[PDB]
Design a protein around this ligand. Structure first.
Ligand SMILES: [K+]
Ligand SMILES: [K+]
Ligand SMILES: [K+]
Ligand SMILES: [K+]
Ligand SMILES: [K+]
Ligand SMILES: [Mg+2]
Ligand SMILES: [Mg+2]
Ligand SMILES: [Mg+2]
Ligand SMILES: [Mg+2]
Ligand SMILES: [Mg+2]
Ligand SMILES: [Mg+2]
Ligand SMILES: [Mg+2]
Ligand SMILES: [Mg+2]
Ligand SMILES: [Mg+2]
Ligand SMILES: [Mg+2]
Ligand SMILES: [Mg+2]
Ligand SMILES: [Mg+2]
Ligand SMILES: [Mg+2]
Ligand SMILES: [Mg+2]
Ligand SMILES: [Mg+2]
Ligand SMILES: [Mg+2]
Ligand SMILES: [Mg+2]
Ligand SMILES: [Mg+2]
Ligand SMILES: [Mg+2]
Ligand SMILES: [Mg+2]
Ligand SMILES: [Mg+2]
Ligand SMILES: [Mg+2]
Lengths: 58, 203, 63, 144
RNA sequence: AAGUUAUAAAUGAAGCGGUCUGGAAAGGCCCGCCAAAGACGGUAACAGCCCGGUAGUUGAAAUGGCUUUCCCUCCAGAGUGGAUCCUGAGUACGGCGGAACACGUGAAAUUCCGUCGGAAUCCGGGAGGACCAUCUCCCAAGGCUAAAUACUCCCUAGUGACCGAUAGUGAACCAGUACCGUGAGGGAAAGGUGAAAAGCACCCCGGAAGGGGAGUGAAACAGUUCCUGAAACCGUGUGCCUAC
RNA sequence: CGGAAAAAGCGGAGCCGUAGCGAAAGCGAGUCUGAAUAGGGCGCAUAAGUAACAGGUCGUAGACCCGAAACCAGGUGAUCU
RNA sequence: GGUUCGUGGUAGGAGAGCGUUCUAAGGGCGGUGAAGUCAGACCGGAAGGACUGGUGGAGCGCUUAGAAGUGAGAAUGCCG
């Protein structure tokens, strides 16, 4: 699971609280499964909203 | 002092500076530099395994309680037969160096000690047509050396190292290498005119 | 390796030329209505770390 | 080498603890009996007092370190007697003579002592008194 | 192609010197000798001159590597102008949430991740520890890049004020074995005849084992856990004492 | 760098000390406080350090030796139950 | 070398030494018998060191310095 264009995906960091208790979490990407042309043909692929807001054709 | 050819004939005399050869030696300084050098020589390649390096351990061999055996935590603890060593050796450099002035003084002093003990031999030159331990030994009788000795050379001296290196009590060096230890390790000091001039201008 | 200097001690001591250690007095934050002016004009000064305490802390602020 | 006898009091046999009662360093090995200090790794921090508040925590912090601080190499008058009168002293000269190695942020000449000799001196800052003494010997002063 | 090197090797000085001990001489004593060779090891005991060898000098058919030469391949670079044009966009930054920077949100610069927003683009843009101006230095959002650095399952030659068989690798011996465990996995113990098997022909007791002679050997109280053989331990015998 | 897993030579960058006082600016045999030239604190007067060795001790490292019950991480196990 | 005062000692401080393994140098014994081991009625103020003899059957002391895996009677110690 990763964007086919800019390979952004789940990275990991901490969840901090008041009292600065550190716990562990992941930041997932806003990946949407939509058609694009991978090549001269189409395909239904995970792509990111950032990469999608302008420049890529559904 | 006297100056004599490798034939053993008197060639004349050298004036040796009392800056180097004429001072009173400091035997304490000389000792300290000897030990510095002898201890910088040692290689320090010793090592032993502790309870963390010995292969095994991990299992506690029995319960802390209820067996009647003494409480134990590893089959490789020190008290155990095939077990670890507790501190033991670890690789070390022993090399230490005293100050340069102290070391210069040491060399000046050991040389002047050789002078006072009348164990210098200063000779006009020292050459061999070819490496020939026969000829070198014969020189070592044409000057009544007959003990352990250190030859010091800077001239042409094309074959003298080879013609000496088979002899056990004999050592040869190119006049920069002259050490406190390498001197004291020998009895007599056989220094050529050019070698002494070079040692002078160094010191 | 080399010894780490005690930083809470570095921030509040100071050396002299005799190698002794100077400090500030320590009832001097927030209740000066309950402290005579004779007391405060002295606490605003400095002080020398005592011998018994120096014997304990010298090796934390050797540098 | 068979006669080596180093200086007296330069060397001294290591105390070896825990090798008998006649050594006086035997069984307990200078640790006594049964406490935190008789243990391996035993002891406490250097400024620990039993949970009593340490000295440093019972007194206040003070100050700030300036970043544009200027500290200056401190020269006295006594050194300047080494030079024949009427000559010129400089930072470069004072370094060449090994009086100084570090021009920290500058040179400063202080009136500790006395001169006997007329001199022209130039440096970064002078003390008032040293300026006075240099002039009183007929010297002169420049500020670099 | 040439040279060099590595992977086989070759040649290589000088005492069977005499005598003493001795089971045996390499050792003692007296004579010599060689040495660019007195490193090491072995040989009936401590060998420069007995052996292998060492120093030195030579050499490699074949293969591999390295260094040079050639081939082969491929190669526009200075200047003056500067109409105009280009110079890394969903990034650079910002908000929110986290992290890395010695720097724990702290006044928090700088770098990075996720998500929202979202630039100028040469009279432009960034940094100089919030930030503003000025000054100075520099051109991001594209990529490559040896050397110096780190390590050693391995190969070659060697070193040790390192161990010397409860040490040293767990393992000096057919050891990751036997053995334990369903399994992952844990994990030992155990070296020494003698210079040479010359390893006891033959006889006697005995079913054999094991002995006693004989014999070998310097030695068998060195006889196939075989150099030495401590102490605990087990016994035989006896000088002195001991059953109010 | 040099060189024998050497010894010298080179290397003075830096370190310590020689001047301290002060939060600092800064002043300097004085300095800070303070209105002060006062007194007082710290210094100087009242000048020996430095490099290396060894001994003692302290700190960081397992730090003197042995010893928990427990915690965490990766795996093995339902041939018993 | 003398005079005076002293000379019980745990924790603990201070000092001087004995001994073991190794190294360097000097100088030595040792198959006409080394280390080791066994026995002894010797020596020194102590740790300890010699001598003699037996067994063993090839290496080891002494001296001055140096460096340490440095000296065990106990750890319900570990192995045999
Ligand atoms: K040999
Ligand atoms: K920040
Ligand atoms: K810049
Ligand atoms: K004052
Ligand atoms: K014996
Ligand atoms: Mg472990
Ligand atoms: Mg002692
Ligand atoms: Mg003591
Ligand atoms: Mg005591
Ligand atoms: Mg005891
Ligand atoms: Mg106790
Ligand atoms: Mg108590
Ligand atoms: Mg106590
Ligand atoms: Mg409390
Ligand atoms: Mg023999
Ligand atoms: Mg920025
Ligand atoms: Mg943020
Ligand atoms: Mg952090
Ligand atoms: Mg963001
Ligand atoms: Mg700024
Ligand atoms: Mg054995
Ligand atoms: Mg073993
Ligand atoms: Mg036997
Ligand atoms: Mg009776
Ligand atoms: Mg399973
Ligand atoms: Mg007493
Ligand atoms: Mg021990």
């Amino acid at each position: 699971k990763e964007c086919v264009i800019t390979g952004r995906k789940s990275r990991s960091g901490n969840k901090r609280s008041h009292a600065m208790n550190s716990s562990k979490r992941t930041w997932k990407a806003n990946l949407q499964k939509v058609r694009i042309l991978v090549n001269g043909k189409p395909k239904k692929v995970w792509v990111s909203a950032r990469a999608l807001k302008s420049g890529k054709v559904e | 002092l006297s100056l004599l050819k490798q034939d053993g004939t008197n060639a004349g005399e050298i004036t040796l500076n009392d800056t180097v050869f004429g001072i009173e030696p400091n035997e304490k300084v000389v000792v300290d530099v000897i030990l510095s050098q002898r201890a910088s020589l040692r290689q320090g390649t010793h090592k032993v395994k502790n309870r963390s390096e010995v292969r095994g351990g991990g299992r506690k061999p029995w319960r802390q309680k209820g067996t009647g055996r003494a409480r134990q935590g590893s089959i490789r603890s020190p008290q155990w037969r095939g077990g670890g060593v507790v501190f033991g050796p670890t690789p070390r450099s022993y090399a230490y160096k005293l100050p340069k002035k102290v070391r210069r003084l040491a060399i000046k002093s050991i040389l002047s000690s050789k002078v006072n003990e009348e164990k210098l031999v200063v000779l006009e030159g020292l050459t061999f047509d070819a490496p020939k331990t026969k000829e070198f030994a014969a020189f070592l009788k044409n000057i009544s050396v007959d003990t352990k000795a250190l030859i010091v050379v800077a001239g042409e001296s094309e074959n003298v190292e080879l013609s000496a290196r088979n002899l056990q009590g004999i050592t040869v060096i190119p006049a920069e290498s002259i050490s406190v230890l390498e001197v004291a390790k020998h009895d007599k000091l056989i220094i050529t005119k050019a070698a002494v001039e070079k040692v002078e201008e160094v010191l | 390796p080399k010894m780490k200097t005690h930083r809470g001690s570095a921030k509040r001591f100071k050396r002299t030329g005799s190698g002794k250690l100077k400090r500030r007095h320590g009832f001097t934050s927030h209740m000066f209505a309950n402290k005579s002016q004779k007391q405060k004009r002295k606490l605003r000064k400095s002080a020398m770390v005592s011998a018994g305490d120096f014997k304990r802390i010298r090796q934390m602020v050797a540098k | 080498l068979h006669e080596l006898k180093p200086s007296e009091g330069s060397r001294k046999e290591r105390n070896r603890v825990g090798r008998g009662t006649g050594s006086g360093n035997g069984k307990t090995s200078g640790r006594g009996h049964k406490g935190q200090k008789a243990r391996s790794g035993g002891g406490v921090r250097l400024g620990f007092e039993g949970g009593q508040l340490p000295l440093f925590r019972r007194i206040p912090k003070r100050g700030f370190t300036n970043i544009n601080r200027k500290e200056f190499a401190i020269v006295n008058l006594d050194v300047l007697n080494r030079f024949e009168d009427g000559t010129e002293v400089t930072p470069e000269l004072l370094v060449e003579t090994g009086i100084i190695r570090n021009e920290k942020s500058g040179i400063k000449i202080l009136s500790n002592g006395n001169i006997e000799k007329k001199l022209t001196v130039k440096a970064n800052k002078f003390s008032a008194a040293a300026k006075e003494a240099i002039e009183a010997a007929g010297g002169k002063t420049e500020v670099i």
